[PDB]
Design a protein around this ligand. Structure first.
Ligand SMILES: [Zn+2]
Length: 463
């Protein structure tokens, strides 16, 4: 019998908060239970740390400059994926699967082939944290997926949850200098990489996220207590969505279809979680935002106690071929992803990514400051057109990315070697990166570098 698939994706969800990754306890027990039956990938980099580019890319198995959906802007700034591009939904539908999608779309046409049902917001009251339509829509999504799974073959079902994206609304309610609303639970500690060591040693676009990113403008002058309350809220919205994941899985396993279902849990991108002073996602490529949870379990998938760290994976590219392989569906040769089904099955992985990549372009076209990330087996390299800025982090010895090695002459060979990987990427993927124009108004680079120095309203008000 062909397997069913349930893909659960949570917007902003991070490795740090998912207990299976070993950093934070107590926030994701239902996800951790799935992980404990299957396989989790340590190195799972998304193609862009932003929702619409990530999703347009994910469901088509392509990179953002190829879909040409490079920001969150709507039509005509970004155009829907052409109907001739194969997608996860087209491939599965054409192979006899019922393909259904619940929850957040934000796909710019890459969900073609799925039958989508729009969720309806179901409001509720939270006595300690701000909640908004992000959280209320998730209630509807959960109801929809529960109803579907409680009476389902073969099928592929996506449940696209918003949380912990309600962190964005939290930041708005706590913008600027403020005293935090008291909460009852423990107040988390700041991460080891909270502080930026040296602002002069990071790229211009990253130095001025306070100017270009509304949420960073709002948090720029936050104190340490303020950031700790941010982390608490992030954990709270994570717990909230984890309860919905539990409800969805209970529905799945309530009929005989469940045991024949492969479950995937992932995120479109992560969240700064105060690391590098960052809130949410914008411009930078640090692991908190680019390296997401990527968990599989189900029939034929052999349990692995240890996270898989010997492979570099790219969910944005790899999900489509992995699911097709598990379903016995031929993948178009042009798709650049690499099926992980052999690793999942305990069979020989004959092909793997030598490196993985992420992209930045713009958020809403106020500031266009393209960049690229290359994660090799050990080091992460970043480049930004603006100022020709570069980063180089030793991910083995400096997993917090505190120490930029790009200007250290001891690392000049390593730096060259990673520039060369970017060159290979640009060639093979037909990236127009090197020809792109920076549009970064000097008004958004007009104070001493770094967020504590930020003055004034930021790009969306000034430009
Ligand atoms: Zn600023």
């Amino acid at each position: 019998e062909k397997p069913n698939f349930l893909i659960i994706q949570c917007d902003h969800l991070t490795q740090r908060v998912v207990g299976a990754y070993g950093q934070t306890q107590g926030c994701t027990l239902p996800i951790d239970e799935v992980a404990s039956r299957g396989v989790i990938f340590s190195n799972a980099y998304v193609g862009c740390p932003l929702s619409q580019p990530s999703r347009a890319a994910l469901w088509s198995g392509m990179m953002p400059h190829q879909t040409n959906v490079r920001s969150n802007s709507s039509e005509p700034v970004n155009t829907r994926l052409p109907e001739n591009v194969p997608t996860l939904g087209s491939l599965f539908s054409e192979s006899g699967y019922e393909a259904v999608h619940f929850g957040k779309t934000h796909d710019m046409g890459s969900l073609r082939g799925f039958k989508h049902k729009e969720p309806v917001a179901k409001p509720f009251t939270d006595p300690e944290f701000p909640v908004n339509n992000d959280s209320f829509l998730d209630v509807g999504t959960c109801e929809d997926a529960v109803a579907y799974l409680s009476n389902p073959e073969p099928f592929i079902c996506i449940a696209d949850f918003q949380n912990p994206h309600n962190i964005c609304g939290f930041i708005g309610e706590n913008a600027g200098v403020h005293t935090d609303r008291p909460i009852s639970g423990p107040l988390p500690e700041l991460p080891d990489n909270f502080d930026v060591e040296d602002w002069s040693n990071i790229p211009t676009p990253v130095q001025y996220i306070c100017c270009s990113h509304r949420r960073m403008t709002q948090a720029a002058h936050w104190n340490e207590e303020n950031y700790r309350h941010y982390i608490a809220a992030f954990q709270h919205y994570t717990k909230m969505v984890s309860k919905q994941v539990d409800s969805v899985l209970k529905a799945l396993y309530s009929t005989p279809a469940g045991r024949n279902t492969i479950v995937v849990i992932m995120a479109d991108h992560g969240d700064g979680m105060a690391s590098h002073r960052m809130v949410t996602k914008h411009i930078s490529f640090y692991d908190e935002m680019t390296n997401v949870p990527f968990i599989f379990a189900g029939p034929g998938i052999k349990q692995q106690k240890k996270p898989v760290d010997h492979l570099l994976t790219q969910p944005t590219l790899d999900l489509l071929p992995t699911l097709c392989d598990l379903a016995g569906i031929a993948v178009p040769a042009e798709k650049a992803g690499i099926s992980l089904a052999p690793t999942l099955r305990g069979e020989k992985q004959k092909k793997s990514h030598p490196y993985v990549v992420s992209e930045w372009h713009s958020e809403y076209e106020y500031v266009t400051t393209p960049g690229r990330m290359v994660r090799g087996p050990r080091y992460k390299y970043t480049h930004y057109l603006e100022g020709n800025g570069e980063e180089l982090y030793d991910m083995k010895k400096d997993p917090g990315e505190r120490k930029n090695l790009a200007k250290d002459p001891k690392y000049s060979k390593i730096l060259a070697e990673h520039r060369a990987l970017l060159d290979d990427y640009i060639t093979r993927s037909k990236d127009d990166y090197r020809s792109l124009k920076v549009d970064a108004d000097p008004r958004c680079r007009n104070h001493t570098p770094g967020y504590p120095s930020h003055e004034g309203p930021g790009a969306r008000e000034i430009l």
